[PDB]
Amino acid sequence: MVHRVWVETAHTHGGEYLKADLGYGEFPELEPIAKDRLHIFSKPMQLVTEKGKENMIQRGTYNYQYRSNRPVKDGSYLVTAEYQPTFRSKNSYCEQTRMFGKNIVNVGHESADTAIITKPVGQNLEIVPLDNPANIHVGERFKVRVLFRGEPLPNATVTATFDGFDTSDRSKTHKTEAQAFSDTTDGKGEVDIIPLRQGFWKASVEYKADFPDQSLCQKQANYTTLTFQIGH
Amino acid sequence: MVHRVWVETAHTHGGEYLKADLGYGEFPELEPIAKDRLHIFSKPMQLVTEKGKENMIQRGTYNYQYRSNRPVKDGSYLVTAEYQPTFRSKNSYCEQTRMFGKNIVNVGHESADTAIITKPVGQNLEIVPLDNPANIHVGERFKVRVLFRGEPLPNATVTATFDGFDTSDRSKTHKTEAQAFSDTTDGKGEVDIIPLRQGFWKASVEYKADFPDQSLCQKQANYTTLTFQIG
Ligand SMILES: [Zn+2]
Ligand SMILES: [Zn+2]
């Protein structure tokens, strides 16, 4: 199984702590980070608000569970997670792998702000929402932009699925990778996700390129995810 | 403007003439085949029934319309179309483009046969339905197989969209339409399409490989579609 990174947040109101989960594995099944993988997630997930980025605290039964340091007010925030760069041999060349996850969390039933969630956080490969998904009904268009090394990335494939779309016969050795959406970005790096069902959605984009410093490593693979809610 | 090939068939009851349409361009909008492109479609579309393959006659207002020879009996048939192989330079090297279309046509309500439609018609890249779409409701799984050069093609990306999913862009981008489904074929070349809406669906796969005879051309691109009705 190829493991990927995503973020999930609990439904949260103003005045309570924000609870979040680092998914490393096969969406949407959360799993504890294994002993031999703890070094990859050496930095905690981050909460992005008006005051910028802050670390979250790893609290809970399982090591993928985090909470905000302080109770959060009503608003629209980001929770980010990162697979720190790892190097492996392939064939024979070196490849660096990096993964990123970002969750849009609306704290409060009427929160649909865009000031925070539309600003890039600096992920090497990033999906930046250009609108708040709380305003998107089934069949409507939800515009995002893909950034690579800070610049818009054209002709990249963005796919998207939701929790419960593909469940038949899931096991440790079976499928459930079907997507309910796929399109490619334009010259501005933008693409409209069109959700056909309410629920917990995950959009995905990957980019393989040359590693910047060719004297040290040759290739670089990036896998980036954006999670959000459609409906209420 | 990309320009891909698909097939449409009008609603046909048994005993009348099966009208079909060659789509060359941006699904779902049919368009007359331009002058400088006529040589690409040198062979007419084919109707596949119990008696096998038969040519269709290019009858109608526009040059993309085709009518069956004799009227058709109730059943489940295929209508295939082909973009004949063309060569071009890229970068420098030669690439041969081939495209295929296949429509599943159910003549007569309550017809949902699997005998003809599940048989490979021999397209270089082909989507073979392993069930009749008449039995597939919204949310259910429609299994198809992808064959390249007669053999199952694993890890191939099959996408699917429907008429009305993406309603943007006249010509101010001409980009390929948004898809409402995407997944990869398994080791047997099979994949389940999960339609989330009723309507007229098109599934797509493309495979780029080395050309067989490296002394004539270097690359080969294949674009194949399968059109059908859900609900
Ligand atoms: Zn609530
Ligand atoms: Zn009728």
Q: Which of B37, B28, B22 is nearest to B177 (CA)?
A: B28
Tokens representing residue A162 in the block: 């939701």
Q: A-chain residues within 8 Å CB-CB of B197?
A: 196
Nearest CA in chain A to B190: A175
In the chain, the amino acid numbered B168 is: S
The alpha-helical segments, DSSP class H, found in B29-70 are none
Question: Is the separation of the CB atoms in A123 and A87 below 8 Å?
Answer: no
Q: How far, in Å, are A103, B15, B16 from residue B73 at the CA level?
A: 55, 5, 8
Nearest CA in chain A to B157: A178
Reported resolution in A? Answer: 2.1
Cα separation, B113 vs B15, whole angstroms: 17
DSSP letter, residue A171: B
Burial code (b: 16+ CB inside 10 Å, e: under 16) for B19-49 equals: bbbbbbbbbbebeebeeeeeebbeeebbbbb
- Which residues of chain B form beta strands (DSSP E)? 4-9, 19-25, 46-49, 52-55, 65-67, 75-90, 93-107, 125-129, 142-148, 151-152, 157-162, 181-184, 190-193, 199-210, 219-230
Greatest extent of chain A over all pairs of C-alpha atoms, in Å: 54
Q: How far, in Å, are A55, A108, B24 from residue A50 at the CA level?
A: 14, 16, 51
Rg (CA), chain B: 17
Q: Which residues pair with B229 in a beta bridge?
A: B200
In the chain, the amino acid numbered A5 is: V
Q: Experimental method used, please?
A: X-ray
Question: Is the separation of the CB atoms in B114 and B76 below 8 Å?
Answer: yes
Can you tell me which residue has the tokens 């489940």?
B76
In the chain, the amino acid numbered B218 is: Q
Expressed in angstroms and rounded, the spacing between residue A18 Cα and the centre of ligand 1 is 13
Q: How far, in Å, are A18, A107, B21, B194 from residue A134 at the CA level?
A: 18, 11, 41, 25
Determine, for residues A182 and B159 on separate chains, whether the beta-carbon distance falls below 8 Å: yes
ω into B28 cis (within 30 of 0): yes
Cα separation, A11 vs A57, whole angstroms: 18
Cα separation, B126 vs B100, whole angstroms: 7
Chain B, 164 to 183: residues with Cβ < 8 Å from chain A are 165-166, 168, 173, 175-176, 178-183
Helix (H, G, I), strand (E, B) or coil at A96: strand
Cα separation, A139 vs B111, whole angstroms: 31
Cα separation, A52 vs A47, whole angstroms: 8
Q: Which residues pair with A66 in a beta bridge?
A: A20
Residue A155: CB atoms within 10 Å: 11
Greatest extent of chain B over all pairs of C-alpha atoms, in Å: 54
Cα separation, A99 vs A223, whole angstroms: 5
Tokens representing residue A133 in the block: 């998904």
Q: A133, exposed or middle or buried, with CB in 10 Å at 0-12, 13-18, 19+?
A: buried
Can you tell me which residue has the tokens 């515009």?
A143
Question: Is the separation of the CB atoms in A47 and A18 below 8 Å?
Answer: yes
State the nearest Cα–Cα gap between B113 and chain A, in angstroms: 25
Cα separation, B91 vs B165, whole angstroms: 34
* Partner residue opposite B183 with nearest CB, options A179, A186, A196: A179
Tokens representing residue B139 in the block: 């949310």
- Give B231's contacts (C-beta < 8 A, 6+ positions apart): B137, B138, B198, B199
Q: What are phi and psi of A135, to 5 degrees?
A: -90, 0
Left, alpha or beta for B185 (phi > 0: left; psi -120 to 50: alpha)? beta
Determine, for residues B197 and A196 on separate chains, whether the beta-carbon distance falls below 8 Å: yes
* Partner residue opposite A177 with nearest CB, options B175, B183, B197: B183
- Give B92's contacts (C-beta < 8 A, 6+ positions apart): none
Determine, for residues A182 and B178 on separate chains, whether the beta-carbon distance falls below 8 Å: yes
Q: Which of B158, B18, B5 is nearest to B77 (CA)?
A: B18
Expressed in angstroms and rounded, the spacing between residue A63 Cα and the centre of ligand 1 is 26
* Partner residue opposite B182 with nearest CB, options A159, A196, A197: A159
Tokens representing residue B119 in the block: 């048989």
Q: A47, exposed or middle or buried, with CB in 10 Å at 0-12, 13-18, 19+?
A: buried
Cα separation, A202 vs A100, whole angstroms: 12
Rg (CA), chain A: 17
State the nearest Cα–Cα gap between B171 and chain A, in angstroms: 14
Determine, for residues B184 and A192 on separate chains, whether the beta-carbon distance falls below 8 Å: no
